[PDB]
């Protein structure tokens, strides 16, 4: 478990995914997407089986956030290769991405560029839909540690004001 967590942390972070998804071809991107789908499905099942609760909560959420940042960054570039690659990779990985609803909203906003029409644009549209259709995601299980609890309290106060 120790060495496994260390290896996965060295792979996820260090900013390798972003360029390695630029370099490879289409089918190579599909394959790497399948690999990430498998590893994340197994990790999430391990988490939801309660086995990892001590500190794996914070580290797992950090991994999810770093992967979300990397994809949101690479998905925004002018080239054609990066766009087609990101589209294929997400078309593979989006099947299991029950992260915080904030993350799904962030990916939906980043994919909602809708620039001049093309083939990439036609492909991006079904990849902006069929992922917002999740709309079932958990956000409380993450943590309350940081001052973010105060921001949640302020948002709750704003919602209470709205209720009137």
């Amino acid at each position: 478990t120790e060495n496994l967590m260390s290896i996965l942390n060295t792979c996820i972070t260090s900013n390798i995914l972003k360029t390695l998804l630029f370099c490879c071809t289409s089918s190579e991107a599909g394959n790497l997407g399948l690999f990430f789908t498998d590893v994340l499905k197994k990790l999430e099942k391990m988490r939801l089986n309660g086995d990892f609760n001590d500190q794996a909560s914070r580290k797992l959420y950090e991994w999810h956030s770093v992967i979300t940042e990397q994809v949101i960054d690479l998905l925004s570039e002018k080239n054609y290769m990066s766009i087609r690659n990101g589209i294929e990779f997400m078309k593979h990985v989006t099947s299991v991405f029950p992260v915080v609803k904030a993350h799904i909203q962030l990916v939906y906003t980043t994919l909602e560029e809708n620039l001049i029409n093309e083939e990439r644009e036609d492909i991006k549209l079904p990849s902006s839909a069929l992922i917002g259709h999740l709309k079932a995601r958990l956000k409380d299980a993450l943590e309350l540690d940081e001052f973010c609890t105060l921001t949640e309290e302020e948002a709750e106060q704003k919602r209470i004001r709205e209720m009137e």
Binding site: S14, N15, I16, T19, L20, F22, C23, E77, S82
Partner: peptide
Amino acid sequence: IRQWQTLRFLRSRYLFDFDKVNEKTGVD
């Protein structure tokens, strides 16, 4: 395209020295 070819060729030797690319000329 030149960056694409150089990257395809360097994927085996020095993978972890890839953060420097960042949609720009190969940072040596």
